Amino acid sequence: FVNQHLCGDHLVEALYLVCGERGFFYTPKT
Amino acid sequence: GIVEQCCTSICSLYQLENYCN
């Protein structure tokens, strides 16, 4: 997948695509 | 981990792992 400039939403979408079955520590958050 | 390296810079997927996990 799109291994370049992916941000905020596309970036989380990706984090999940990658370890969505693992855990999902997407924070990097507020 | 991801942001100013893979979004606002580039290391994308390879890196993603390292934090998504």
UniProtKB/Swiss-Prot annotation, chain B:
Disulfide bonds: 6-11
Stretches assigned to coiled coil: none
Tree of life domain: Eukaryota
Protein name: Insulin A chain
Residues included from the entire protein: 90 to 110 of 110
